[PDB]
Amino acid sequence: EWLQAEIARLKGKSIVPLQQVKTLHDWLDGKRKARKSCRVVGESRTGKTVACDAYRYRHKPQQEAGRPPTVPVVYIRPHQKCGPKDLFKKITEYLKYRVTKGTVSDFRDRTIEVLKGCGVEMLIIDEADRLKPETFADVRDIAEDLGIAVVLVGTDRLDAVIKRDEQVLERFRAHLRFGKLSGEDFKNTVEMWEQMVLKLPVSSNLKSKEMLRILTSATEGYIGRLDEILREAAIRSLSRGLKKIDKAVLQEVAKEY
Amino acid sequence: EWLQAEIARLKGKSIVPLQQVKTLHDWLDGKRKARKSCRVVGESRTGKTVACDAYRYRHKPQQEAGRPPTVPVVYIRPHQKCGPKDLFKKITEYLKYRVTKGTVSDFRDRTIEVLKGCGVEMLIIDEADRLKPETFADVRDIAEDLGIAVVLVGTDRLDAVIKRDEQVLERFRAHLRFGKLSGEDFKNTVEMWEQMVLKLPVSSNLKSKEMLRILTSATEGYIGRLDEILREAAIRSLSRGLKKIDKAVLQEVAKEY
Amino acid sequence: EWLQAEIARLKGKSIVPLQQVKTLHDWLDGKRKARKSCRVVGESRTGKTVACDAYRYRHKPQQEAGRPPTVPVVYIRPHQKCGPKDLFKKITEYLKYRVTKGTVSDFRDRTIEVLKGCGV
DNA sequence: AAAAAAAAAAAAAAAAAAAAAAAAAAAAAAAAA
DNA sequence: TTTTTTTTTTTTTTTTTTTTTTTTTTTTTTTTT
Ligand SMILES: Nc1ncnc2c1ncn2[C@@H]1O[C@H](COP(=O)(O)OP(=O)(O)O)[C@@H](O)[C@H]1O
Numbered sequence: 001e002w003l004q005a006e007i008a009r010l011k012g013k014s015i016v017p018l019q020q021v022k023t024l025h026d027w028l029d030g031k032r033k034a035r036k037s038c039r040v041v042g043e044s045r046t047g048k049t050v051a052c053d054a055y056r057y058r059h060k061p062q063q064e065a066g067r068p069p070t071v072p073v074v075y076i077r078p079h080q081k082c083g084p085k086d087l088f089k090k091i092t093e094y095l096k097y098r099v100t101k102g103t104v105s106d107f108r109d110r111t112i113e114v115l116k117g118c119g120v121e122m123l124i125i126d127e128a129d130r131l132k133p134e135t136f137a138d139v140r141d142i143a144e145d146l147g148i149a150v151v152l153v154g155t156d157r158l159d160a161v162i163k164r165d166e167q168v169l170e171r172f173r174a175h176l177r178f179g180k181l182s183g184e185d186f187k188n189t190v191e192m193w194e195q196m197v198l199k200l201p202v203s204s205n206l207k208s209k210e211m212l213r214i215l216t217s218a219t220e221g222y223i224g225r226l227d228e229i230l231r232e233a234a235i236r237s238l239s240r241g242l243k244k245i246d247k248a249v250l251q252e253v254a255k256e257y
Numbered sequence: 258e259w260l261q262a263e264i265a266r267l268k269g270k271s272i273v274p275l276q277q278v279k280t281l282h283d284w285l286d287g288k289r290k291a292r293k294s295c296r297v298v299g300e301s302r303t304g305k306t307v308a309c310d311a312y313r314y315r316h317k318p319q320q321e322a323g324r325p326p327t328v329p330v331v332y333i334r335p336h337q338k339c340g341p342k343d344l345f346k347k348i349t350e351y352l353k354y355r356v357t358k359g360t361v362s363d364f365r366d367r368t369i370e371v372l373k374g375c376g377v378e379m380l381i382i383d384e385a386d387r388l389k390p391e392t393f394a395d396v397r398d399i400a401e402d403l404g405i406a407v408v409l410v411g412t413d414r415l416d417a418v419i420k421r422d423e424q425v426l427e428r429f430r431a432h433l434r435f436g437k438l439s440g441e442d443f444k445n446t447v448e449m450w451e452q453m454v455l456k457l458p459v460s461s462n463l464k465s466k467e468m469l470r471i472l473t474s475a476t477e478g479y480i481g482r483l484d485e486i487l488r489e490a491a492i493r494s495l496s497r498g499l500k501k502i503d504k505a506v507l508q509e510v511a512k513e514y
Numbered sequence: 515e516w517l518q519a520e521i522a523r524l525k526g527k528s529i530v531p532l533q534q535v536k537t538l539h540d541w542l543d544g545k546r547k548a549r550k551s552c553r554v555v556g557e558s559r560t561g562k563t564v565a566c567d568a569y570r571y572r573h574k575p576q577q578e579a580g581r582p583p584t585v586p587v588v589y590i591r592p593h594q595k596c597g598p599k600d601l602f603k604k605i606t607e608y609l610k611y612r613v614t615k616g617t618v619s620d621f622r623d624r625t626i627e628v629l630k631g632c633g634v
Numbered sequence: 635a636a637a638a639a640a641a642a643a644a645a646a647a648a649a650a651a652a653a654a655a656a657a658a659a660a661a662a663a664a665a666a667a
Numbered sequence: 668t669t670t671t672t673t674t675t676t677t678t679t680t681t682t683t684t685t686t687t688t689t690t691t692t693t694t695t696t697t698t699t700t
């Protein structure tokens with residue numbers, strides 16, 4: 001069944017180029033060449049993790065000689081209430097280096113060693129709100145001991161937590177802020193996203209004022225909502241024999257959430 | 258004594274089908290196939306818990322091969338003031354895997370491991386109100402990390418707690434409601450209940466208005482209350498040498514409860 | 515330099531099929547089907563190590579099922595004076611499972627678990 | 635001058651981070667036959 | 668040419684101390700029209 005193949009294909013995830021993504025990539029590349037630490041602030045379901053992650057694929061570490069890998073960008077997602085030891089362990093795990101059983105001071109020394117051996121000019125920390133207040137001192141300690149840029153990606157809680165300590169705030173003053181979709185930006189994004197993700201036999205008439213209206217009402221500018229809504233509508237539309245997404249199907253999916 | 262066997266039958270619990278149960282089962286099957294998080298909210302004594310139990314029994318784990326048995330659906334019942342560590346322990350023990358000792362980080366790692374190895378399509382959490390606010394920060398983390406359709410089940414209090422965090426509410430936007438029985442639905446439920454759950458030999462027509470008024474006034478549309486009343490009336494009537502429910506016995510029971 | 519490229523090729527390692535190796539492979543397949551323990555005794559500098567490694571390459575890990583790797587054949591090289599802890603740990607690490615730091619009893623149970631989950 | 639449900643100032647429950655002894659058991663090995 | 672005693676050498680297994688949050692329950696609300 002061809003429909004089965006399309007269902008399986010849609011149930012996946014794909015990357016669709018966007019302007020804000022390119023802006024973030026260029027800004028972060030500038031910071032990486034300057035070795036200047038910074039932070040990034042945005043709302044949930046805006047796709048900032050996808051931008052931080054898509055950037056790292058381009059700069060994947062490649063080593064041809066017998067010497068160990070030289071990695072320029074390392075990327076870790078801390079768990080809830082991640083402490084100092086837990087964070088160091090993740091840095092070591094990402095570099096495919098054997099964790100040494102021992103104490104926290106041993107973890108600190110080992111982390112400095114593995115980071116000194118490789119490049120690791122830029123470190124992208126996601127979900128920085130979850131980071132425990134005790135650990136930020138270690139983060140900036142690393143940023144000062146070695147010339148490595150540190151990027152703290154978080155929401156408004158990141159702002160709130162950072163502004164409580166003077167040194168951390170001084171270290172991470174420069175920043176980039178994400179926005180939401182609206183107007184022509186939103187319409188162009190919907191058109192581009194459907195052309196990039198949907199290969200349905202017939203057009204969905206997305207440009208129509210009414211479809212844009214209901215998608216705006218259900219989306220509110222959050223790409224993390226538009227992607228899910230349109231993918232579910234597509235799977236359901238194809239499942240009922242409709243090659244294209246239809247107005248009633250859109251209304252149904254929007255009503256469920 | 259034949260009456261003793263009948264009494265044993267009446268005291269033991271049984272499961273019957275209802276419109277709400279079938280609706281929930283179809284809805285949850287959809288959510289499980291699409292790997293989407295959702296929640297179930299309704300009043301107490303409406304029987305939604307038994308619906309979850311029946312759904313689990315339908316999807317029995319299958320282990321044809323010598324490898325780890327497939328476990329499609331997981332169902333956990335947290336106790337009062339439940340934390341993250343105990344939640345992880347319950348998930349681990351439900352899958353017949355030993356619980357290694359150590360800090361919470363090890364518990365998170367072990368839980369992710371055992372959930373990856375088995376199928377673990379959808380995870381259902383009964384009486385979700387008992388969980389602490391901090392436990393949701395890990396439930397949602399699992400939902401984002403792996404393709405599991407986490408399902409929260411509880412009362413109206415659940416929404417009041419979920420609204421405290423923007424991200425938790427953003428994750429769960431779909432829901433199904435359970436509610437009271439009334440009118441023709443209530444009358445049909447009573448008539449069906451007399452035939453299946455009760456083991457009385459003759460008569461006991463609860464369709465009539467006189468008995469319906471009693472059961473309606475005492476029950477208030479809650480299915481669990483109805484079950485209690487009918488079983489007790491039948492047992493007491495059998496003890497009194499009666500083979501059919503009589504209005505006087507029905508009246509006597511409800512004023513004690 | 516072309517000559518240096520040829521030299522770099524000659525300094526490499528190659529594998530050549532011999533009747534000795536094929537005999538060992540057929541024998542090992544028989545023993546695996548029979549699920550019977552056995553042993554191979556052979557002199558030094560005979561290449562039996564390479565033959566066993568090639569056998570391992572014949573059957574690659576089968577990830578075709580959705581949850582575990584289901585690797586049917588494992589191959590470990592113990593160090594000198596290999597203790598029980600190091601043995602269990604090598605077996606565990608070969609299957610991409612983290613080491614549950616503890617006592618040798620914990621390593622024993624953990625190794626049994628990962629050996630049951632995988633084909634082995 | 636008489637009446638008011640809402641911020642500060644106080645007790646239990648979990649959770650995590652580090653030395654510091656003590657004994658057993660074995661394995662080799664040098665001297666002595 | 669093996670045996671006794673030494674000698675070392677791993678190897679393994681077990682007790683005490685401190686700090687930081689979260690959450691909930693009374694008294695105060697003086698301040699306010
Ligand atoms: N550039 C993109 N292309 C395609 N899908 C995207 C993109 N950005 C975000 N998404 C959708 O949004 C989700 C990722 O958003 P998320 O990483 O949760 O945002 P954040 O982590 O910044 O809160 C994915 O499920 C994906 O489908």
Ligand SMILES: Nc1ncnc2c1ncn2[C@@H]1O[C@H](COP(=O)(O)OP(=O)(O)O)[C@@H](O)[C@H]1O
Nearest residue numbers: 271272273301302303304305306307480481484
């Ligand atoms: N389909 C059913 N068949 C038999 N008994 C039921 C059914 N649904 C509910 N009940 C009765 O109602 C009670 C169910 O309440 P419960 O499952 O605890 O719901 P809740 O969790 O909302 O309180 C049980 O005691 C059971 O006897």
Ligand SMILES: Nc1ncnc2c1ncn2[C@@H]1O[C@H](COP(=O)(O)OP(=O)(O)O)[C@@H](O)[C@H]1O
Nearest residue numbers: 528529530531532557558559560561562563564
């Ligand atoms: N079938 C073979 N193909 C290629 N080289 C071989 C083969 N058999 C032996 N060799 C050579 O012999 C060496 C392998 O010997 P080795 O594995 O050390 O034997 P063992 O360890 O059993 O003494 C390699 O350096 C390799 O070049």
